[PDB]
Design a protein around this ligand. Sequence first.
Ligand SMILES: *[C@@H]1O[C@H](CO)[C@@H](O[C@@H]2O[C@H](CO)[C@@H](O[C@@H]3O[C@H](CO)[C@@H](O)[C@H](O)[C@@H]3O)[C@H](O)[C@H]2NC(C)=O)[C@H](O)[C@H]1NC(C)=O
Ligand SMILES: *[C@@H]1O[C@H](CO)[C@@H](O[C@@H]2O[C@H](CO)[C@@H](O[C@@H]3O[C@H](CO)[C@@H](O)[C@H](O)[C@@H]3O)[C@H](O)[C@H]2NC(C)=O)[C@H](O)[C@H]1NC(C)=O
Ligand SMILES: *[C@@H]1O[C@H](CO)[C@@H](O[C@@H]2O[C@H](CO)[C@@H](O)[C@H](O)[C@H]2NC(C)=O)[C@H](O)[C@H]1NC(C)=O
Ligand SMILES: *[C@@H]1O[C@H](CO)[C@@H](O[C@@H]2O[C@H](CO)[C@@H](O)[C@H](O)[C@H]2NC(C)=O)[C@H](O)[C@H]1NC(C)=O
Ligand SMILES: *[C@@H]1O[C@H](CO)[C@@H](O[C@@H]2O[C@H](CO)[C@@H](O)[C@H](O)[C@H]2NC(C)=O)[C@H](O)[C@H]1NC(C)=O
Ligand SMILES: *[C@@H]1O[C@H](CO)[C@@H](O[C@@H]2O[C@H](CO)[C@@H](O)[C@H](O)[C@H]2NC(C)=O)[C@H](O)[C@H]1NC(C)=O
Ligand SMILES: *[C@@H]1O[C@H](CO)[C@@H](O)[C@H](O)[C@H]1NC(C)=O
Ligand SMILES: *[C@@H]1O[C@H](CO)[C@@H](O)[C@H](O)[C@H]1NC(C)=O
Ligand SMILES: *[C@@H]1O[C@H](CO)[C@@H](O)[C@H](O)[C@H]1NC(C)=O
Ligand SMILES: *[C@@H]1O[C@H](CO)[C@@H](O)[C@H](O)[C@H]1NC(C)=O
Ligand SMILES: [Zn+2]
Lengths: 585, 185
Amino acid sequence: EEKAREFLDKFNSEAENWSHESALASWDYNTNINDKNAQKMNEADSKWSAFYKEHSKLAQGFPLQEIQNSTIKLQLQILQQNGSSVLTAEKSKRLSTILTTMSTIYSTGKVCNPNNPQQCFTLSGLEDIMEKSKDYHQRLWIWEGWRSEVGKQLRPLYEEYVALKNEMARGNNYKDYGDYWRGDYETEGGDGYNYSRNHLIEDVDRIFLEIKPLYEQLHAYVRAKLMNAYPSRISPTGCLPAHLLGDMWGRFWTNLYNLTVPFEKKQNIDVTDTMKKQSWDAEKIFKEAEKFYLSVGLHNMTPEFWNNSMLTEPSDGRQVVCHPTAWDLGKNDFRIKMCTKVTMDDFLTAHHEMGHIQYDMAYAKQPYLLRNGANEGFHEAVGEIMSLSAATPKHLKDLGLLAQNYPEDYETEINFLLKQALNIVGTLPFTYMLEKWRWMVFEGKIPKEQWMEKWWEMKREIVGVVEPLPHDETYCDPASLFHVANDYSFIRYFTRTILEFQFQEALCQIANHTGPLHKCDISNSTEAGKQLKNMLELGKSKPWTFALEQIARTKEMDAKPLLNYFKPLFSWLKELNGNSVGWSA
Amino acid sequence: KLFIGQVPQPYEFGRLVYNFTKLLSYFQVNTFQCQKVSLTVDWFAYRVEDKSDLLPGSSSDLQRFNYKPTYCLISAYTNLVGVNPTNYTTLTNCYGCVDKDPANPWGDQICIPEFVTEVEPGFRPKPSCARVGLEGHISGNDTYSAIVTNGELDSTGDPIWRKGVALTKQPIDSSRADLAFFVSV
Ligand SMILES: *[C@@H]1O[C@H](CO)[C@@H](O[C@@H]2O[C@H](CO)[C@@H](O[C@@H]3O[C@H](CO)[C@@H](O)[C@H](O)[C@@H]3O)[C@H](O)[C@H]2NC(C)=O)[C@H](O)[C@H]1NC(C)=O
Ligand SMILES: *[C@@H]1O[C@H](CO)[C@@H](O[C@@H]2O[C@H](CO)[C@@H](O[C@@H]3O[C@H](CO)[C@@H](O)[C@H](O)[C@@H]3O)[C@H](O)[C@H]2NC(C)=O)[C@H](O)[C@H]1NC(C)=O
Ligand SMILES: *[C@@H]1O[C@H](CO)[C@@H](O[C@@H]2O[C@H](CO)[C@@H](O)[C@H](O)[C@H]2NC(C)=O)[C@H](O)[C@H]1NC(C)=O
Ligand SMILES: *[C@@H]1O[C@H](CO)[C@@H](O[C@@H]2O[C@H](CO)[C@@H](O)[C@H](O)[C@H]2NC(C)=O)[C@H](O)[C@H]1NC(C)=O
Ligand SMILES: *[C@@H]1O[C@H](CO)[C@@H](O[C@@H]2O[C@H](CO)[C@@H](O)[C@H](O)[C@H]2NC(C)=O)[C@H](O)[C@H]1NC(C)=O
Ligand SMILES: *[C@@H]1O[C@H](CO)[C@@H](O[C@@H]2O[C@H](CO)[C@@H](O)[C@H](O)[C@H]2NC(C)=O)[C@H](O)[C@H]1NC(C)=O
Ligand SMILES: *[C@@H]1O[C@H](CO)[C@@H](O)[C@H](O)[C@H]1NC(C)=O
Ligand SMILES: *[C@@H]1O[C@H](CO)[C@@H](O)[C@H](O)[C@H]1NC(C)=O
Ligand SMILES: *[C@@H]1O[C@H](CO)[C@@H](O)[C@H](O)[C@H]1NC(C)=O
Ligand SMILES: *[C@@H]1O[C@H](CO)[C@@H](O)[C@H](O)[C@H]1NC(C)=O
Ligand SMILES: [Zn+2]
């Protein structure tokens, strides 16, 4: 152990040094996109990778069987895992080529109008249409078009991809690549703080069943609404048409809100006009976000944060990517990159991204390799709960953004919950179903000959969505989604959503919140903040179930907090729908 | 003056804005407790047997839907002969409702138990909630439920509907009134 301890100590010191240089070069690129910064980024990343691999190989000299300290054992497990290298040179190179190819096919995909070949849109255009248009035919040829133009090109690549990733996983002592992806949750330890990979399946399956009753109410409701929007297209007891779900994949139903809004006459809360009247700007927005976190006993934003961060879109001719991201560069250097406008959407986003910085700061004291979230879904879960709080009527009133005498309209709260349900609940069946499908594909439960047969069978049974047109096995609809084509784990969105409400509810209980969870504001709750920090400061140095207990007082994922959040919507939907809840397949 | 005429129920508590010994010559106090101690008095009918619901920090329907003190409590009984209450009516619940059909603001309602309408300390129950209590006190159903609106409008100008539950209890001693008095400086 002592030799491994010295090894990791040396590694961690140098790793922060090299990682910092890598992060700096990447930052400079993203806030100033040109050839000079791109070159610095590529060189700094290369130096980092060479460093990491050098020590990864050296780490093989420290058997885990000789280690008693959990901190050392854990860091060695991270540096030691081979990952891709367990593969031979030919398969490693081939896999890289395939992954690059799938990404390229997706990003350069376009679909042309079959009745007007001269009218053709790129993915960005197609998304804009699928997220806006109310025309049955326009949405249909785009939905089918995307599957034909992109899905059919990725099909054969996804098949080879699955085979190669499974071999990679086996070379690392996993059953398959699905098992590899379920690795991030797995933890070891005494008492009830251990978590086998197989347990993740049991938890997500158990949770879905607990969520389902809520979703059936939302589904039947949306069905009833779309039946009027698209007359004679939808069966009263059947599944929803896949192309009429608000976007290209049916991932978020948010854009259906205009069609499914419970009480159209009632507007939601939007303080954009107030922020503009009061002359808010990017700096003020982030300063208010800081005040929020400080009120619960968390840390200051560093002088370096305010100086280095890019909170506004440059007017100096510099080209940037405005997509909001939080950065941790190491050496106590924290930054946010976000082209903030004076809107409610960016107001809430500023809170979201600063939440990520607060988490990154919390475990800054930890060993480099352990400087991450307890799991993949912990970072976004922390961000989202801060947004939920920031968006409440109560918080907005206290900030002077929402009129103090603004009435408590129950119709508005139903519209709010409905909109939130379309985004948060509607996506859960999708995420669950998608991962269930992929895991079964990697595991070998769903054979190539039944990939689409089971994809759509599962869509009807789990999500309640039906394919507008029948598909054979030359299709690969899952691959037409960004996260699938680009080899990302999608379960993080399922677990994040569940954890999001466990954290919010637990913090709301500590804060002594009474009434509906969707109106909970954890501002000025230093007790909840302390309980939160107790979890945040751990990074991934402890079993994530240990980290979970520190905040939610449980060692397992729990659906109840979500059901509680949307409980007022559930009751409304239930009485509105009566006995037409649910669907046939 | 507060002993002249009838006595209001918890959901419609009266408010009015001295010699304590003389007060004790009108009523017999069973519980006298003070918190952190022009004067304002909030008063309503309430049973002695369930007097525990008058004490701060207790979890009860009285302090949730009818009246929650903002921070001395005098729980006492007296014969007003004013007049004595026939019975005691307390809201056990109240929650927001929305219209089933958006095309008709006055039509069939869907009520949501989770949209709990809290009394809010120092505030009367919202008029939709108070109306339920007022009806329950006269309906004679031992527990009275109703979906009502009472002159309060939303951000558009449509009626605000609420559903409440008003539970009526019979006294053991029908010859006296049991009253709760909340006196603040
Ligand atoms: C978190 O706690 C802070 C205090 O540490 C709260 O800020 C304060 O908000 C109250 C109102 O809720 C302010 O008092 C009021 O000011 C207005 C004038 O704007 C006056 O008309 C009222 O009669 C009353 O005096 C108070 O001044 C203000 N404090 C500061 C330093 O701004 C904050 O709202 C809380 N956020 C919460 C509970 O969510
Ligand atoms: C609690 O005490 C109140 C009195 O303070 C009781 O209200 C009285 O209830 C009776 C019986 O329902 C009412 O008489 C009936 O009136 C209707 C007309 O609305 C008539 O059709 C019936 O034939 C009968 O005469 C009486 O009018 C009503 N008092 C008042 C002022 O309206 C209440 O019922 C008691 N609650 C319980 C649970 O005992
Ligand atoms: C849902 O309705 C809102 C309006 O209530 C739409 O937002 C407007 O869209 C038009 C057309 O692009 C803009 O000119 C307005 O400025 C937008 N208003 C606001 C407040 O942003 C929204 O696009 C509709 N959504 C869908 C899917 O149709
Ligand atoms: C990562 O790769 C190394 C090889 O570079 C693996 O180390 C071997 O492990 C086996 C036991 O399974 C030993 O018999 C070999 O002698 C080891 N070789 C070397 C060079 O150390 C290591 O086990 C792999 N990591 C994992 C988790 O499988
Ligand atoms: C934590 O580890 C314990 C074992 O120490 C696991 O309990 C076993 O679970 C398997 C599978 O259900 C059973 O067949 C064994 O009989 C159980 N053993 C004991 C002693 O109970 C436990 O499930 C693990 N916890 C998690 C979340 O994976
Ligand atoms: C949240 O509410 C609980 C009561 O429901 C509070 O707990 C009591 O707090 C007082 C001190 O304020 C103690 O004397 C009691 O013994 C506590 N009761 C129990 C059962 O714990 C709790 O302090 C409140 N939390 C906050 C942050 O206000
Ligand atoms: C593991 O090593 C760290 C030093 O990196 C030390 O602080 C910790 O107490 C050790 N834990 C055990 C169980 O020895
Ligand atoms: C945050 O910054 C403010 C302003 O300088 C300071 O008063 C406060 O103590 C700081 N809080 C923490 C936890 O550092
Ligand atoms: C921000 O940092 C740069 C670093 O070169 C410095 O030149 C600039 O003056 C700083 N701006 C401040 C401190 O407001
Ligand atoms: C009156 O009581 C009966 C019997 O419990 C009940 O069925 C009815 O709904 C009640 N009516 C009201 C207004 O509470
Ligand atoms: Zn995020």
